[PDB]
Amino acid sequence: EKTCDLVGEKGKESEKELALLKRLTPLFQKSFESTVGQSPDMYSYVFRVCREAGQHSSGAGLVQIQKSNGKETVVGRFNETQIFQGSNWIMLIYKGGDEYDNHCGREQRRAVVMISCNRHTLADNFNPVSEERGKVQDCFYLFEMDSSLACS
Amino acid sequence: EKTCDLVGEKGKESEKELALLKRLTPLFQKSFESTVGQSPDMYSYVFRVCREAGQHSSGAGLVQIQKSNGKETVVGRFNETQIFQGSNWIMLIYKGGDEYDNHCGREQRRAVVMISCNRHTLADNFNPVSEERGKVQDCFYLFEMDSSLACS
Ligand SMILES: *[C@]1(O)O[C@H](CO)[C@@H](O)[C@H](O)[C@H]1NC(C)=O
Ligand SMILES: *[C@@H]1O[C@H](CO)[C@@H](O)[C@H](O)[C@H]1NC(C)=O
Fold first, then answer.
1. Which of residues 88-147 of B touch A (CB under 8 A)?
2. Strands (DSSP E) along A1-87, which ranges?
3. For chain B, which domains are there?
4. How far away is chain A from the Cα of B11, in angstroms, using its nearest Cα?
């Protein structure tokens, strides 16, 4: 089966990153969702680690769904993954998402997920911090979530 | 004196963001440095919160200095600031940095600083987690630091 493909020349992939990637495997089969806003402008976010996250769109690790019409916006693809480790957290990044084409310009979207250390849970509390959705215009997608895996 | 200029309109800056900004004022007159790599390829990083960080450049909140010749690269300007608050951390973003004229593309550089909560210190432990420097080619600048200000 397919997994996350690190950003770099096939092989040049830092041993370090690959170590982090492996550390996250227990989350692979899991799925994280979050719904924000109020009707008719409610949006939903589905996040998966190195797995398909959308129903329709393919290759997405994080998708934004407009509930009023079910349209899926790819925020990041797991075939362009970057992963870093800070003091007591891990930052996961999915690049190559659908382009803005609005006040944000036309660069591609990327998904940034802050995985904070929480010794009391495998993985939960997934929620958006910064978004580009409706009235919210950050031109940036930042998500946070808890996991004992990110504990150093 | 010149402070950070939030990204957005002009009087459409979010109270929320302006709230975080004021929250960080105690660090305005501080300076943070970090030196990495080995000679002849040592690079130095200087970071300031809403204050000038360069010695030759201007409008920069975070600069990358090549020590073999003193050339100052601006990674982010505090006139294009974005700030977000997570569960127990604050993320400061400086946009509008010199453009990548290499393998990274030609988009402008941006400075991303992870400010984690540490009740035992006002501010310290400024360190680079991700960089575009020398043979390190992340095409991303991620920094981390400790500060009780980011608490709660
Ligand atoms: C990856 O993102 O998959 C999409 C699928 O459409 C391609 O368009 C990209 O070129 C792929 N990027 C890389 C670096 O493999
Ligand atoms: C920030 O200052 C630089 C200085 O050259 C300028 O080019 C840039 O347009 C400014 N950005 C904003 C949003 O004012």
1. 88-89, 91, 93, 107, 114, 116, 125, 129-130, 137-138, 140, 142, 144, 146
2. 32-36, 43-47, 60-66, 71-85
3. 1-152 (2.70.130.10)
4. 15
